[PDB]
């Protein structure tokens, strides 16, 4: 089955970027102001996308993003049957990647607040895997951060993918997408990294619910859990319209 | 219309680098010494140029700089009709990119000084979008910073563009220009990023005048607003003469 | 002898990355919080692998890692006779590279604790060349760090090496492997750099035993010296199985 | 004259890297602990070499280093007549590049110690352009830093240049050399950047003698001025022998 081989590549690809991305976030969170800052978090997340694409690019096209997968299906470039398979394959692997990060820092995570698992607060460890609203990053303000961030990601992704452009060889397509992830994190008000990925958010968040953080990861921040899922999906639609209206529709 | 399609690519390209570049500047300015320093500002601005060129390189040549556009027209490589169209397309998109950054940090910008918009000072938010003279960066000292900075940018741009050189494939022409932007910011005494772009300066500055900062953005620093426009234009002329006298005129 | 020429390339390649990698570690350790942090250590180690591969890639394939060499021999891609020759050639050169770093910082290393050589502690200089357990990086916790780290390295290495993929040209195979080394150090809880290399660990550690640190470098941390040797070897086996089960076995 | 065109490319190439490299050093020195650290100095110097090579690579081969030029002449790859012409062309342009940096920071340099120019000390500004011995970087210790640093630079340069290797296309030869410069600065105990270049050292040092710092720049540190000239020259000879004995002589 061709679809099965593409799904396994998406599972391994999302496993690489989540394990590498959330692993660097664990170092900064657990070692408060000692192992680096936000620059290392975005550099690790940005470079992890480059490595993840190179691993699974030749098999499944290296989407590693349900918002990106939704964009190609919306543009009639890929069949709609690939969307549920890729999304489950992208979510399963971010769940697995979060488990590896949990195993790596099992003692440090459990010792952050003594012998308890705290979701949000000063000694909060659930923010390593998922994203939670900040002081100026509430639901209203944070919703537009994912919308604009994902729209910019889709525009840059479609620029290097459109067949009407030059056939960029292998290698100069993961560094570019990895550059977009690094710049988006540095530009937007998100300090977790790769916030424009619904699978990178819901996957590890679902793991934290079963890891021992309880159901509070889904009923906190005025039910914020669905925002990093719906908002990037809307941004993919907006990013597609922006690219098509400006560049896409004029390439005869 | 071919010129219309090239103008739309220049508008989207300047939108990407301004929104990404000024977004990182907003993080450092609003979060004083928390989200990074000048290294992240120049890295984001330098990488944003790489992404912006890759998006619009195959359509309009990816100038994204009125000084760069003036250089090609001066060297008789492009028609003079493209200069007013590209400049307006480069300015419109830096205006739009500044509006997106304003929407992203609307609450944080307005809360920097309580409920007021301050142009310059300790709690100054107008410096996120435009550039203003510093203690050692006055009109006399700052004028030569744009002249030398733009001249070095034009020399590096003409080196990878001259047809007498090797036909560099797609991909190794945005990273190089993006490298020049990053090095120029690190070398020159500008902490805003990409100061050698007249569109990146006048565009967001014009937005701040209508955003709520008043007309003080145009009548401050002994009328500094015209310096980051005329000085890079003179640097493009000087950079063209430097490259032609040393390398350009000797390529038979 | 073809095998002799490949061994000499492996010796020089491991010499470059060890001398460059451990040299940056010496700057941070000796200049406590002055010459940079962990970001510079991983950047130097990651970029040193890129330079080392480019130097010896065209001769011996640029393994520079006994775990990587074990993976290719396990996958029947290289003869088993190359494993003992490459491992000795990789160990000899990390021993030589450590001697160069020792000569560079001979006065600073000896003056860290007055006129004595201390293996572990506050004024510990043996950690520049080798790796020692930390507070949360004991034998049990540190063993899985090398296992997961090396498994991720093998998966990324096999992705760009498998003949069934695109023939990536020279240049886009050292930056990718160098990216993996940089990301692994930023993700995993190791602050020394390139901890997934048995030769980079045992080589300089053997040098410190004869340099003047005594035999305490081999009988400290509950005999930790063998962990960064056996654990990456097991990770190479696990990394091979992960890549083959997900991607490798499905490429007809 | 072919030699005249190659000399003009070497003059412009050394002008780019010196002006960009020393400009970042001026920011860190004048703004004490505000504009960055040693990481930005090595990143700017490393990336400046990449830009300088791309500008003058197609004309003069982009040596930009008398030690590198001496290596090719020693290996009988280039005529010996090119050595005096390239060295003068490399020195003239580092002298010019230092003058541009002086003009950029004329007020800040003169105001470091009031209205005086101090060569060495706390308020020392002559270290921006040239290199001076540190506490642990005296003549005996600093001599071996240039020897090992230049030997590693020559080995990496000869690896990507030898015709027996793959014909690396344009673009993947300036980033590699620029990587070597960045790693060498991070590894070695030099905080100025690109210390393995005799032209980058003597050029700006000669400018400081006539700029107003007096003749003390040549009679300080027990006559240290000749060390960053002779020592890299010896390192080029050692680096050539290392590469030839290990890799060079075995490529039939």
Residues of chain C that touch chain D, judged by Cβ-Cβ distance less than 8 Å: 5, 8-9, 11-12, 16, 19-21, 23-24, 27, 35-36, 39-40, 43-44, 47-48, 50-51, 54-56, 58-59, 100, 103-108, 169-172
DSSP B242: H
Q: A64 and A14 in contact (C-beta within 8 Å)? A: yes
Tell which phi-psi region holds residue D225, choosing left (phi > 0), alpha (psi between -120 and 50) or beta: alpha
**CA gap C227, C230 in Å, rounded:** 6
Mutate to test the interface with C, among A2, A15, A55 (most CBs of C within 10 A): A55
What's the first-to-final CA gap in chain B, in angstroms? 35
**CA gap D248, C5 in Å, rounded:** 10
Q: Cα distance from D165 to chain B (closest Cα, Å)? A: 20
Task: Count residue pairs from B and D with Cβ separation < 8 A.
Answer: 99
CATH number assigned to the domain comprising residue A36: 1.20.1080.10
**CA gap A44, A22 in Å, rounded:** 9
**CA gap A144, A125 in Å, rounded:** 25
For residue C127, CA distances in Å to C22, C98, C146, C194 come to 10, 12, 17, 13
Indicate the number of domains in chain C: 1
**CA gap B88, A21 in Å, rounded:** 40
**CA gap C32, C18 in Å, rounded:** 21
Q: By C-alpha distance, which of C53, C79, C236, C219 is closest to C148? A: C236
Return the structure tokens found at A107: 């003692």
The residues, ordered by sequence, that sit 6+ positions from D232 with a Cβ below 8 Å of its Cβ are D66, D67, D146, D147, D149, D150, D196, D197, D198
Pick A247's closest partner by Cβ from B12, B21, B51.
Answer: B12
DSSP letters spanning B222-234? TT-TTHHHHHHHH
**CA gap B179, A56 in Å, rounded:** 28
**CA gap D49, D175 in Å, rounded:** 8
Contact A54 C159 (CB under 8 A): yes
Touch between chain A and chain D: 3 or more Cβ pairs under 8 Å: no
Return the structure tokens found at B146: 């744009």
In degrees and rounded to multiples of 5, residue B75 shows phi and psi of -85, 10
Residue C58: list chain D partners with CB under 8 A: 165-166
Angle at A74 between CA A73 and CA A77, to 5 degrees: 50
DSSP A161: H
Q: A16 and A178 in contact (C-beta within 8 Å)? A: no
Pick D187's closest partner by Cβ from C8, C44, C103.
Answer: C44
In degrees and rounded to multiples of 5, residue B232 shows phi and psi of -65, -30
Return the structure tokens found at A87: 């999304």
Pick D246's closest partner by Cβ from C12, C100, C171.
Answer: C12
Q: By C-alpha distance, which of C39, C21, C69 is closest to C237? A: C69
Task: Write the burial class of residue A234 (CB in 10 Å: 0-12 exposed, 13-18 middle, 19+ buried).
Answer: middle
Q: If you count DSSP H runs as helices and E runs as strands, how many of each does chain A have, helices first?
A: 9, 0
Q: A153 and A238 in contact (C-beta within 8 Å)? A: no
Tell which phi-psi region holds residue A80, choosing left (phi > 0), alpha (psi between -120 and 50) or beta: alpha
**CA gap D91, D96 in Å, rounded:** 9
Please name the residue that has the structure tokens 């990294």: A193
- Domain containing residue B16: 2-250
DSSP C119: S
- The set of chains that have 3 or more CB pairs under 8 A with C is A, D
Mutate to test the interface with D, among B36, B146, B159, B196 (most CBs of D within 10 A): B159
Task: Write the burial class of residue A220 (CB in 10 Å: 0-12 exposed, 13-18 middle, 19+ buried).
Answer: middle
Q: C24 and C40 in contact (C-beta within 8 Å)? A: yes
Return the structure tokens found at C146: 């090398």
D81-98: b (≥16 Cβ within 10 Å) or e: ebbebbbebbbbbbbbbb
Q: B251 and D12 in contact (C-beta within 8 Å)? A: no
Give me Rg for the CA atoms of chain C: 18
**CA gap D91, D213 in Å, rounded:** 19
For residue D190, CA distances in Å to B199, C61, D50 come to 39, 33, 20
Angle at A44 between CA C163 and CA C14, to 5 degrees: 55
**CA gap C148, C137 in Å, rounded:** 14
Residue C189: list chain A partners with CB under 8 A: 27, 104-105, 108
**CA gap C175, B171 in Å, rounded:** 15
Pick B136's closest partner by Cβ from D43, D108, D172.
Answer: D108
Q: A218 and A130 in contact (C-beta within 8 Å)? A: no
Contact D152 C16 (CB under 8 A): yes
Closest-CA residue in chain C for A11?
A: C246
Return the structure tokens found at A43: 């550099």
Task: Count residue pairs from C and D with Cβ separation < 8 A.
Answer: 99
Tell which phi-psi region holds residue C221, choosing left (phi > 0), alpha (psi between -120 and 50) or beta: left
Closest-CA residue in chain D for B147?
A: D104
Beta strands per DSSP E along C149-207: none
Return the structure tokens found at C46: 């990651």
For residue B123, CA distances in Å to B34, B164, B225, C38 come to 16, 51, 20, 33
**CA gap D132, D124 in Å, rounded:** 11
Return the structure tokens found at A66: 């349900």
* H-helix segments, D131-173: 139-161
DSSP B252: -
Angle at B32 between CA B29 and CA B38, to 5 degrees: 65
Return the structure tokens found at A191: 């300090």
Kindly report the three-state secondary structure assignment for every residue of B155-196.
HHHHHHHCCCCCCCCCCCCHHHHHHHHHHHHHHCCCCCCCCC
Task: Write the burial class of residue A80 (CB in 10 Å: 0-12 exposed, 13-18 middle, 19+ buried).
Answer: exposed
Write out the H or E segment, with its range, that includes residue B115: none
For residue B108, CA distances in Å to A194, A236, B117, C41 come to 22, 26, 11, 35
**CA gap A78, A66 in Å, rounded:** 13
The residues, ordered by sequence, that sit 6+ positions from A75 with a Cβ below 8 Å of its Cβ are A158, A240, A244
**CA gap C197, C188 in Å, rounded:** 14
**CA gap C91, C96 in Å, rounded:** 9
**CA gap B20, A183 in Å, rounded:** 7
Residue C179: list chain A partners with CB under 8 A: 47, 50-51
DSSP letters spanning B84-106? HHHHHHHHHHHHHHHHHHHHHTH
Q: B72 and B222 in contact (C-beta within 8 Å)? A: no
**CA gap D250, C187 in Å, rounded:** 39
Residue C100: count other Cβ atoms within 10 Å of its Cβ. 19
Q: By C-alpha distance, which of A60, D180, D72, A54 is closest to C16? A: D180
Q: C173 and C37 in contact (C-beta within 8 Å)? A: no
DSSP letters spanning C9-29? HHHHHHHHHHHHHHHHHHHHH
């Amino acid at each position: 089955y061709r679809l099965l081989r593409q799904a396994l590549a998406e599972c391994l690809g999302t496993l690489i970027l989540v394990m590498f991305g959330c692993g660097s976030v664990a170092q900064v969170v657990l070692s408060r102001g000692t192992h680096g800052g936000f620059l290392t978090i975005n550099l690790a997340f940005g470079f992890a996308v480059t490595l993840a694409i190179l691993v699974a690019g030749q098999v499944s096209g290296a989407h590693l993003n349900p918002a990106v997968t939704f964009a190609m299906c919306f543009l009639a470039r890929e069949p709609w049957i690939k969307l549920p398979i890729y999304t489950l394959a992208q979510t399963l692997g971010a769940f697995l990647g979060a488990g590896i990060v949990f195993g790596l820092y099992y003692d440090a995570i459990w010792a952050f607040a003594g012998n308890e698992l705290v979701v949000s607060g000063p000694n909060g460890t659930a923010g390593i895997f998922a994203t939670y609203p900040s002081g100026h990053l509430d639901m209203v303000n944070g919703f537009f951060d994912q919308f604009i961030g994902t729209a910019a990601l889709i525009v840059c992704v479609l620029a290097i993918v459109d067949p009407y452009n030059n056939p960029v060889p292998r290698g100069l397509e993961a560094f570019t997408v990895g550059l977009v992830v690094l710049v988006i994190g540095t530009s937007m008000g998100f300090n977790s990294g790769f916030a424009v990925n619904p699978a990178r958010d819901f996957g590890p968040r679902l793991f934290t619910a079963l890891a021992g953080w309880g159901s509070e990861v889904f009923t906190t921040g005025q039910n914020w859990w669905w925002v990093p899922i719906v908002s990037p999906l809307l941004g993919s639609i907006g990013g597609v319209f922006v690219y098509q209206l400006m560049i896409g529709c004029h390439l005869e």
